[PDB]
Amino acid sequence: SAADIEGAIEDYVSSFSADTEREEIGTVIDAGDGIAHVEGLPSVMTQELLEFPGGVLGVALNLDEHSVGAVILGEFEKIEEGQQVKRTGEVLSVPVGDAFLGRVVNPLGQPIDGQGDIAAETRRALELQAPSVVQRQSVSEPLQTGIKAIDAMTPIGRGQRQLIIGDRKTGKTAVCVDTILNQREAWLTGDPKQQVRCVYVAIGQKGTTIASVKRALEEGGAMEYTTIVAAPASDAAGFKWLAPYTGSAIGQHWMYNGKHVLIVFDDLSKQADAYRAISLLLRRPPGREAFPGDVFYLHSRLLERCAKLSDELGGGSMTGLPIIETKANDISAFIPTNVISITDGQCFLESDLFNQGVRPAINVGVSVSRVGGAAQIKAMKEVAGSLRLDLSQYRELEAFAAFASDLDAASKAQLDRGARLVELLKQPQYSPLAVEEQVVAIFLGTQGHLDSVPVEDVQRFESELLEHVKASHSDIFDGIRETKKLSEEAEEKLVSVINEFKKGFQASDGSSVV
Amino acid sequence: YTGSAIGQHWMYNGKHVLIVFDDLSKQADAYRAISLLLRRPPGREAFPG
Amino acid sequence: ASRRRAMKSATDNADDLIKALTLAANRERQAQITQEISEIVGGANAL
Amino acid sequence: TAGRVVRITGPVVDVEFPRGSVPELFNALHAEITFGALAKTLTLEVAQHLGDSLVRCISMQPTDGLVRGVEVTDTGASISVPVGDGVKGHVFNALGDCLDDPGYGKDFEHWSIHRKPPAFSDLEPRTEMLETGLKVVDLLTPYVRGGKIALFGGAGVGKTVLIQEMINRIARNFGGTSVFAGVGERTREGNDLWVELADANVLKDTALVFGQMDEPPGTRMRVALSALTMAEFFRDEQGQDVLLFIDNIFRFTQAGSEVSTLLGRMPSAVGYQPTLADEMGELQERITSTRGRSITSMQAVYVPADDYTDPAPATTFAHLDATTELSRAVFSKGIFPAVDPLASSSTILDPAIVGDEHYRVAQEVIRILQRYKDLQDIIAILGIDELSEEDKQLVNRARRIERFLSQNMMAAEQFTGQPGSTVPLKETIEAFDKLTKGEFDHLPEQAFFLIGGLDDLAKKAESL
Amino acid sequence: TAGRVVRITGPVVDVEFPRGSVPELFNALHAEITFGALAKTLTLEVAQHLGDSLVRCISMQPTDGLVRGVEVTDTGASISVPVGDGVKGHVFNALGDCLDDPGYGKDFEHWSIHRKPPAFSDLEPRTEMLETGLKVVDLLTPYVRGGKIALFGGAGVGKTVLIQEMINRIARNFGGTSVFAGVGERTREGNDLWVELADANVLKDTALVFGQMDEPPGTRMRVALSALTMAEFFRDEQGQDVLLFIDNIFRFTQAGSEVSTLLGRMPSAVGYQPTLADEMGELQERITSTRGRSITSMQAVYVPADDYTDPAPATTFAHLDATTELSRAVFSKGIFPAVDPLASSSTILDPAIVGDEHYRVAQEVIRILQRYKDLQDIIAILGIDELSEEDKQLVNRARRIERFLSQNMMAAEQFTGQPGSTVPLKETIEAFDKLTKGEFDHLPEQAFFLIGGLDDLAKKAESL
Numbered sequence A: 001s002a003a004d005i006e007g008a009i010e011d012y013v014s015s016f017s018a019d020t021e022r023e024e025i026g027t028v029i030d031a032g033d034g035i036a037h038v039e040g041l042p043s044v045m046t047q048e049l050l051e052f053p054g055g056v057l058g059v060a061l062n063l064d065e066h067s068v069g070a071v072i073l074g075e076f077e078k079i080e081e082g083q084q085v086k087r088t089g090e091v092l093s094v095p096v097g098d099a100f101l102g103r104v105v106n107p108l109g110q111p112i113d114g115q116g117d118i119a120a121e122t123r124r125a126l127e128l129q130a131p132s133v134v135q136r137q138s139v140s141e142p143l144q145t146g147i148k149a150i151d152a153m154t155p156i157g158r159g160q161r162q163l164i165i166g167d168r169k170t171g172k173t174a175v176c177v178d179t180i181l182n183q184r185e186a187w188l189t190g191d192p193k194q195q196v197r198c199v200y201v202a203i204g205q206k207g208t209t210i211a212s213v214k215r216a217l218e219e220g221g222a223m224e225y226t227t228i229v230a231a232p233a234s235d236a237a238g239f240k241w242l243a244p245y246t247g248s249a250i251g252q253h254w255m256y257n258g259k260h261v262l263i264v265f266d267d268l269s270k271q272a273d274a275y276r277a278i279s280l281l282l283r284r285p286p287g288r289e290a291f292p293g294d295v296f297y298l299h300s301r302l303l304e305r306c307a308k309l310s311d312e313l314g315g316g317s318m319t320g321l322p323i324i325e326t327k328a329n330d331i332s333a334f335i336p337t338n339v340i341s342i343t344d345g346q347c348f349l350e351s352d353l354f355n356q357g358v359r360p361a362i363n364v365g366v367s368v369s370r371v372g373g374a375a376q377i378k379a380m381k382e383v384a385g386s387l388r389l390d391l392s393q394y395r396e397l398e399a400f401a402a403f404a405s406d407l408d409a410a411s412k413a414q415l416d417r418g419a420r421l422v423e424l425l426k427q428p429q430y431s432p433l434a435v436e437e438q439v440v441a442i443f444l445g446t447q448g449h450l451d452s453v454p455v456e457d458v459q460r461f462e463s464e465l466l467e468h469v470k471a472s473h474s475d476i477f478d479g480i481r482e483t484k485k486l487s488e489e490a491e492e493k494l495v496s497v498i499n500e501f502k503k504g505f506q507a508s509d510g511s512s513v514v
Numbered sequence B: 001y002t003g004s005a006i007g008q009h010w011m012y013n014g015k016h017v018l019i020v021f022d023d024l025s026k027q028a029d030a031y032r033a034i035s036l037l038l039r040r041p042p043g044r045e046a047f048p049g
Numbered sequence C: 001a002s003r004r005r006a007m008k009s010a011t012d013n014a015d016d017l018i019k020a021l022t023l024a025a026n027r028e029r030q031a032q033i034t035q036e037i038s039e040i041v042g043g044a045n046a047l
Numbered sequence D, E: 001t002a003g004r005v006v007r008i009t010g011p012v013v014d015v016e017f018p019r020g021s022v023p024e025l026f027n028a029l030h031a032e033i034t035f036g037a038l039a040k041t042l043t044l045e046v047a048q049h050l051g052d053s054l055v056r057c058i059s060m061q062p063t064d065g066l067v068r069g070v071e072v073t074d075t076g077a078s079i080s081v082p083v084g085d086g087v088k089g090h091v092f093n094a095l096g097d098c099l100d101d102p103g104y105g106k107d108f109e110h111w112s113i114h115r116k117p118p119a120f121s122d123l124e125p126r127t128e129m130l131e132t133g134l135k136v137v138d139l140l141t142p143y144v145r146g147g148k149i150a151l152f153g154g155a156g157v158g159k160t161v162l163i164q165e166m167i168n169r170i171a172r173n174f175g176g177t178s179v180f181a182g183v184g185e186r187t188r189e190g191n192d193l194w195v196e197l198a199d200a201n202v203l204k205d206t207a208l209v210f211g212q213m214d215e216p217p218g219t220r221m222r223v224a225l226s227a228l229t230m231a232e233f234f235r236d237e238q239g240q241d242v243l244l245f246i247d248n249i250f251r252f253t254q255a256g257s258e259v260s261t262l263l264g265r266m267p268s269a270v271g272y273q274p275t276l277a278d279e280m281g282e283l284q285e286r287i288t289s290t291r292g293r294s295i296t297s298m299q300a301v302y303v304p305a306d307d308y309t310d311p312a313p314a315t316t317f318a319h320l321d322a323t324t325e326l327s328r329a330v331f332s333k334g335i336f337p338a339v340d341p342l343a344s345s346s347t348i349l350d351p352a353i354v355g356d357e358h359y360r361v362a363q364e365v366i367r368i369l370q371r372y373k374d375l376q377d378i379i380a381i382l383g384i385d386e387l388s389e390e391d392k393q394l395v396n397r398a399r400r401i402e403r404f405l406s407q408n409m410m411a412a413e414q415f416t417g418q419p420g421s422t423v424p425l426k427e428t429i430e431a432f433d434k435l436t437k438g439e440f441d442h443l444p445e446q447a448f449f450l451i452g453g454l455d456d457l458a459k460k461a462e463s464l
């Protein structure tokens, strides 16, 4: 044991090099509100990581004739006039590598979790060009979010940008953490072509929220493959601005090496606010909602690196799940509409439904997965292809039913079917379901087998039926898993077991659901 | 402030005073004008901070 | 009875319309403040 | 001789030249970035002269790693894009560098992307109708062959779906050539469109130029002109009929606003560039057809924050023969293609150009829908039950008309499965005449969604 | 080594220092005004470094009477607040100078008001209930230990009585301490609060920090941080659970906005400072539980224009975990602590954190009270007899449920004499389970008034 302790320090001592080289040292002539002007540094690169003497760093944005304007990252309260500023010979870049798996790192890759340094393979520039049009292929394989609503109605495909969006306290981080946790079954396979690594970039979230998300991931074994880039609300605007870019860099290193990544950005609205701060402190004129004209460029530059590469570039992918905090369901505001224009579909989590008890509060009709359907296992597509329109129609019809004395028999049937399907989709927190379970549960409702069950008991009927199947006719689950199709033989078996159960199922009123 | 001064002299001497201002929006506009002529930075509705 | 139901629906729709119009009014108020500040600060920046 | 980079402000680079070698406006300059991770030959476009032999340039590639004091060599000519029959069937970037195979097009004729729009003497207003097969467009907003078309929309309304729908309607059977310009749209959409055209065998007749979102404002504003130069080469040098799709033209103005705030030009009304009208005009005016040579154009326009009064859409409205204003309200009703029947307009909706019956039916439909909009307040609070009987019947057939304008577009297949249908103009006119007269006030509303045709209407009515 | 005042523009003061002696950001500098009527020792907080060895500072005191060229002496440390057991029972300003006994606390340990939040590794990953012992809070609005509680209020709704009650409970149940930060506090209401706490005999367990409204924006912005520094000392040194009141947090935001305007920063959003979220994080994130000791906080949040989408509340409410709203409706009916069961809410009230039984009973109580509120219109217009048997039963049960959420608050001991009540959490859960099942519906309404728990209910009923 002591041998390794001595050997590591011995290697450090012997490897120490008297590196006497040439550093261009400049001097700060001004500093305030996260911006520092540095005269000198005649050979500085635009967006270079200048290193100020307090250990803090800065990104050189404006290279004027007199001086360099640097956005300071982190504790700018240490900066003062006259301090030496040293180059670092690296354009804005972050370390990347497999060592980041299971580490909470501030937006520059410096670990904050308290564990040791990170063995970075290399450094990646935060501003590398996204894959060109000819370097992609349409997303062709699913990313099972573990949520019946998302994986049935608006599926997320590997390489897709699915924008979770909704008011405060509406179940967004819950959906993202659930989709991170659900990937453990794939991670354990040990197959890079199927493993899904994760990166959770918290922008402006409270420290306690990041701690809770980390605990939720740890309890579900998700820290073996999940990185956290924490730019808490305490950090300055610079960290909140470039946290998504460092998360995207960590993810891109793996994406270009043939692996699959799931980048969550929580919230990109807090990145936009931090960039508004940086730009206005730089006196760049504001635009709509006081944002700079290039906020769209910020978010698109970010999310356009989330792609499904071609087989010629390793066939890797990076799925983005940006979270946008709307204000009072203003989906037409500036930042929401931007991120919708960049992303490939939105899951709108309505607050009225969240308070009403419908969790996750997926607002049907407004929610859609543009490049969905293609990335969805054939069983789920055959069983849930029509679910979104049916649920939206039920929502439209509920307003009429809320005031109608009586309705057409067809309208009554649709109202009932919707009132059972919405209860079926509802799901408890941190309780992801494998794809087989999701397809069976959605099959129960879409094919009408729930129509005999009272609404209030649907949750139990499904919840227990999956248990009944789970160890009485596991042939169904294994068939779905291996074949990924709901074969007619398996469908007949499934309806047989559903009826066998319904005979023995007792509702809350004591009535049989036969 | 002149009214407040005349009032405060009576106030500190043990008397009870009642000060009316028709209208403080016109003081605010006056101070806005003075500040903007002095190049002091403007905030909401052009008012100085 | 139909009048009770119809006017309950009308009150609910009026409340929802009031909420939506208040949200729109608040957003327009914020937009007016932002635009006014933009004009003032643009004038300042040109001295 | 060569200049010298003197200051860098994001994608804007100021370069100081010798006293006698200042480059002209819109001249292409070459700088170098040597930092290995992102070393590249950086193209700049001179946008201003600042005095003291300085010229301020926009950057086509992202100015990362660029160092003060590096050499800048003027090429003596503006950014050039390849042209010829060769550009058909290939994907190019804003600078004319081919993407599907990098070494392509470096031996073709190269045209400067900056050229004055055709002289007024050669313009004449096109008025021939372009039957697309969609009910809403063919009835209320008849597109103009050889003319400019637009598709205004917020985020998530159906601009790109309808753009590729019209690629299927028009380009798929077009006799001439086509060009598609990705101006600040998704690279995923670019790849999907490329593969779709390859599968539909339309690629061999399309030249694709992309300036997608992941690129700096420079290329994001010059990609439109890069595509438009190939379009104009086809229009003039070859005489072929041309299509020119541009998705999305608002990204042009947004890149303009970014470069404006960087160049130092003061902000305009809502932060846009003061030259919004001029920058938009010098682009749109080139997309016009001329006497004997047609260039149909179809531009998606992003209406930011669903605000149709924004200066960018408010400027691009005046440049269009046919405007199709997609709206959120129609989208949330599920009425695809989501066209607001009232806001949209076409200049050929004149009884002398489309015919008496067509115009009469269109105007009656518009009247019904306008009265429905005027009754929307009472409909929202009280309900249809409290209206007058004439208004009640009008609202019923207004709902039926409004649903009937929906159509199962071909491009919608991927999203819905149900195949696409094309309703010929005569059937649309007859069907909407019948709806307005009230012949179908008895069928349920649900029988008109996404049906597209009288025969399909009868079949779906029987199904319900 | 000492500088000179070179510019005075209202609160903003610019100070020149020798070449290598410029003070660091947020250092506190002392200047002197020597005029007879306005003699003062100004505290200037360095806000920006302007170059040429000039520092722009926001004066914490009026600059009326300051003279150019007057010496400015640098303390070398940020605004220092006294911290200790001695700050209990005294009232301070944002600069640490005592107000009821001037010169006091100058020998105490001094702490910089600017200090980082707890490192990530030291945050508690699980949210834990703070069992206040008040039925209504512990049942329907469970406070999060180490969280922030919105405290809406007004005139006469008993906000100050609730503040006294929470000081009492945190000082007798948890063995902790309370700190009151008057961010923009009316001098009249400040005096009233001081005398009321002195009369309630809880001042000895409370440290008051007032940034009075008459003071420039600097003190109104820094008083929250000074009070939170006192709380952080009580937490991280004396091992006490602390309760930090902040009336009013929106005035912290407004002070930040005003200082931002003074320094020349371009206003953002709706006129608020660009760094709004950053400042709010620097303040709130220091209010958290670390190493088993927590600074709970109750913050009065003024929502401007009654708009929760306004940036100020929309940034405060990202950090608030629970909301307590006091209404005239509940208060006038004799129900103290005046907490509105329906408008109030809490983020910890999910079955995951609280027990499933607790969630069930809380939801049932909310349901019954919501139905009673729905029926109150009918009660007031048509008379109670208009109700059905089920509706009458529900109304009777809801009356007693809402009257049972009252409690003989410890703060009321000074008035009624009877000692306050601390209901155990599970005891409250069982009591409201029984009461929502009607087991106590036969008792008269007056029995439930101001009764602390289940056994006290019976022992008071026997008096009727």
Ligand SMILES: Nc1ncnc2c1ncn2[C@@H]1O[C@H](COP(=O)(O)OP(=O)(O)OP(=O)(O)O)[C@@H](O)[C@H]1O
Residues within 6 Å of the ligand: A167, A168, A169, A170, A171, A172, A173, A174, A175, A325, A359, A360, A427, A428, A429, A430, E347, E350, E352
């Ligand atoms: N599917 C769910 N079922 C039940 N409760 C849920 C569900 N998802 C979230 N919650 C609960 O809702 C509350 C808020 O959840 P969450 O933090 O995910 O919301 P959010 O909108 O992302 O929040 P924020 O804006 O604060 O980050 C927590 O109590 C969480 O436990």
Ligand SMILES: Nc1ncnc2c1ncn2[C@@H]1O[C@H](COP(=O)(O)OP(=O)(O)OP(=O)(O)O)[C@@H](O)[C@H]1O
Residues within 6 Å of the ligand: A340, A341, A342, A368, A369, A370, A371, D153, D154, D155, D156, D157, D158, D159, D160, D161, D162, D185, D247, D248, D300, D302, D336, D337, D409, D411, D412, D415, D416
């Ligand atoms: N006719 C249709 N049928 C079914 N779904 C449709 C239809 N039109 C649009 N959609 C849905 O709406 C989404 C909108 O796609 P589209 O690319 O047109 O949106 P947009 O926001 O206008 O585009 P852009 O990102 O170019 O601004 C489609 O991906 C699909 O999900």
Ligand SMILES: [Mg+2]
Residues within 6 Å of the ligand: A172, A173, A174, A209, A266
């Ligand atoms: Mg969250």
Ligand SMILES: [Mg+2]
Residues within 6 Å of the ligand: D159, D160, D161, D185, D186, D189
């Ligand atoms: Mg599109």
